[PDB]
Every structure is written in C-alpha cells, then in structure tokens.
C-alpha cells in the first residue's frame, strides 16, 4: 500500500512526538517517493536534522530546507526542482500534507502541514498526503509560530524514516 512516515520533532530540544504521514502514492507516485526517500535519507540526504521555518497560526507549518535551513534551499532526489505532478487531491482541511513552492513546477523539498482548510491552495501546491496520528504535534508545532511565520523555538525534525 501507501508509504507510512514518520517525522519525530523537538522544540528547543524537547521532543514533541510523533507525526505520522500517510502517502498518496496511489494518485502522485513522484512526489510521495521524494518525500519518502527524504524522510529514510537513503539517497543521503533528508529531512533529518532539518527545520520547521514558518509558522503560521490557522494556516501551515512549513519546513524541509535541509540545505539553507532558512526557507530559500531543498532539493528532490530528483534533483534540484521537479514539475507538478497533478493537482487532483485538495487541501482539504487540518492534517493535509503538501508541496511548498516559488511557482509552478518548483518542487524541491520543502513541504507543509496543513492546520485548517486552505483551498486557495488548490491548484498551485500539489497535496500528496495526510497526517494519520500526531495531529497534537502538529497542534504543538503550530503554537510556537507567529503571524509572520517566525517560531518562538526551534523546531526541529529530529529523527525521521519509513515505517511501511
Ligand atoms: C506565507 O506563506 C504562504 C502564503 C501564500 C501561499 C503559500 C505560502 C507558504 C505556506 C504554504 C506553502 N507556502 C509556500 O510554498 C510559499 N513559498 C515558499 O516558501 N517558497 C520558498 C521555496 C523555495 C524553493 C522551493 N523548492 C520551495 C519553496
């Protein structure tokens, strides 16, 4: 079935928990393998030891620059960008997981947590999952953030991978 992953998350050094995210490989193949691929590090490189960089209360946690760990870096394993891949699943409410990006086919790595309905999305980032357990991390992730996007604390992904 779908690739279930897991992001373990610390604020100023205290663990968070658990965020488990469910995979939509059965509708963007391409983008939930990137994403799983960055959470095993198995290319090399990944999520591991990166950042939550912008938060933004009723909207998103947003985080996977592991190169310039300031919200202008990512890559794919594709290399660095990687097109849309299609627009078929919605943001839809709290828990959808998607691609941040700096305009049409800019997928690297950086992606987002969903934590309320965000449809003026639709059609510009590409969902391809959803949280399954964990949303009370996210809860905790997005207490932490501001109007402007900067944290209070540094959040960060501490420990990440596969787990089916
Ligand atoms: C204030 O944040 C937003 C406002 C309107 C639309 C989108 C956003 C943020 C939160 C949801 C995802 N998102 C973005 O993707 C904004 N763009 C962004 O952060 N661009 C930096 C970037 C650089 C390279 C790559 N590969 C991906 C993103």
Not at 19 to 32: G, H, I, N, S, Y
Not at 69 to 75: A, D, F, I, R, V
Not at 101 to 116: D, E, L, R, Y
Request: net charge positive; hydrophobic share 35%; charged share 20%.
């Amino acid at each position: 079935g779908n690739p279930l992953v897991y992001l373990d998350v610390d604020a100023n050094g205290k663990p968070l928990g658990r965020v488990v995210l469910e995979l939509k490989a059965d509708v963007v193949p391409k983008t939930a393998e990137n994403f799983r691929a960055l959470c095993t590090g198995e290319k090399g490189f990944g999520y591991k030891g990166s950042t939550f960089h912008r938060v933004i209360p009723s909207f998103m946690c947003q985080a996977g620059d592991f190169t310039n760990h300031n919200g202008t870096g990512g890559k794919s394993i594709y290399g660095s960008r990687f097109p849309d891949e299609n627009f078929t699943l919605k943001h839809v409410g709290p828990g959808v997981l998607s691609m941040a990006n700096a305009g049409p086919n800019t997928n690297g790595s950086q992606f987002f947590i969903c934590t309320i309905k965000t449809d003026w999305l639709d059609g510009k980032h590409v969902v391809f999952g959803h949280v399954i357990e964990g949303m009370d991390v996210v809860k905790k992730i997005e207490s932490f953030g501001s109007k402007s996007g900067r944290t209070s604390k540094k959040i960060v992904i501490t420990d990440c991978g596969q787990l089916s």
